[PDB]
Structure 1
Amino acid sequence: AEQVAAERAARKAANKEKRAIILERNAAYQKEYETAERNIIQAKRDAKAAGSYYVEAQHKLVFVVRIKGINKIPPKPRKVLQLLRLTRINSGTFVKVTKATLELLKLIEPYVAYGYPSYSTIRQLVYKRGFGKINKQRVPLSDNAIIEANLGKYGILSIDDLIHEIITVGPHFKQANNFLWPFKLSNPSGGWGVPRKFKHFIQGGSFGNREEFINKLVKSMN
């Protein structure tokens, strides 16, 4: 009476319940993303028609990549790179924008490329290079149940729940972002552009704020 035929079926029914919830969550998130972006486009249009200027809300998320190697770093940038968990070259981390962290990003400015990531790059980063931290031990995601086993207390059920909590900086961004292992990115597949990396992007190099060109960069590195 080991009840394999009914234990497997009850577990399958629970699996289908969870998948129904995940499906309706993702449909709600897709409608939310679409109405947010169309409302920003229409707000720009309506301000131009009124003669106003629509100023966008300032960006709340940057994606930081350490672009300089390990040797010859001064101790205060070295400490801040460890604190942002950028401990090797082409490491990446999502960063919530506050004053308390925009002054970290000014200290580590010659050693990192950052900017504002789009939904396409967050989606591709988390599907391809997304790893959790589970007793710590760097576990690949590849399953919604293992995401739910550590982030279900925060109401994060699936990988797209994780992506949504990253991109809309929710109340559990800190937990969802510290659960992700720092992204281990390759070199950019086309190159950096820029014959010399270690200038500012404004000055024709790589480091600093490259506000929305970080999407092109990280898609080449991913």
Structure 2
Amino acid sequence: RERERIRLNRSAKNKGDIFVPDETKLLFVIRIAGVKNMPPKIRKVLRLLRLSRINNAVFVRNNKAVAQMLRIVEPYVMYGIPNLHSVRELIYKRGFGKINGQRIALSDNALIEEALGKYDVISIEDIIHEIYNVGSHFKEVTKFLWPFTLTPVKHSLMEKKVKHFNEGRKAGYCGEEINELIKKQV
């Protein structure tokens, strides 16, 4: 916690500039771990970033203000860029919106048209087209959608034996590796 306190003030004081990997309207950020008895500013930022629990999956629009948040929890989260066809399968596999507050899967487009009818979204493909080419309804669709959960899969016999290991996740801007991490996510 003293290391995180030093990491916060060092990155805040005289470090008010961000890297912000460009050429992407959206980014993929996942909290690969957590901090036991974390700072009050860290947990509130985790509540702000909607990654209240580790191994949660949600894509966020890339912005200068988002980059400030992307540099706030980078010690505890890993960022990157989302692939085109990977997100097409991610929504098809782990599309679980907060239907009436309950994280129910979007197994049919009728309920997708019922809730997102005001956003002119009736199908997942139309929702993905409003997500990849992020339109005005991208923020509202993510607001109605509960975040996905990318729990790392323990496949081999070593994955069940290692001491508190999760198939070796990394920290920072994975970029294409974030899509590779998504490729192994589901």
CA drift of 1:146 comes to: 0.6
Contact 1:113 1:208 in 2 (8 A): yes
Contact 1:117 1:215 in 2 (8 A): yes
Match of 1:129 in 2: 94
- Write the distance in 1 (CA, Å) between the matches of 2:154 and 2:169: 17
Match of 1:171 in 2: 136
Q: Greater share of helix residues, 1 or 2?
A: 1
- Write the distance in 2 (CA, Å) between the matches of 1:133 and 1:173: 15
Match of 1:115 in 2: 80
- Write the distance in 1 (CA, Å) between the matches of 2:127 and 2:42: 29
The alignment-based identity, stated in percent, is 53
| Higher alpha-carbon Rg | 1
CA drift of 1:70 comes to: 5.4
* TM-score, with length taken from structure 2: 0.77
Say if 2:179 is the partner of 1:215.
yes
Match of 1:68 in 2: 33
CA-based RMSD of the aligned residues comes to 2.4
- C-alpha distance after superposition, 1:7-57 (max 9, x if no partner): xxxxxxxxxxxxxxxxxxxxxxxxxxxxxxxxxxxxxxxxxxxxxxxxxx7
Consecutive unaligned residues in structure 1, runs of 5 or more: 1-56, 198-203
In structure 1, give the amino acid aligned to 2:61: K
CA drift of 1:69 comes to: 2.9
Consecutive unaligned residues in structure 2, runs of 5 or more: 1-21
Q: Which of the numbers 74, 80, 83 marks the counterpart of 2:48? A: 83
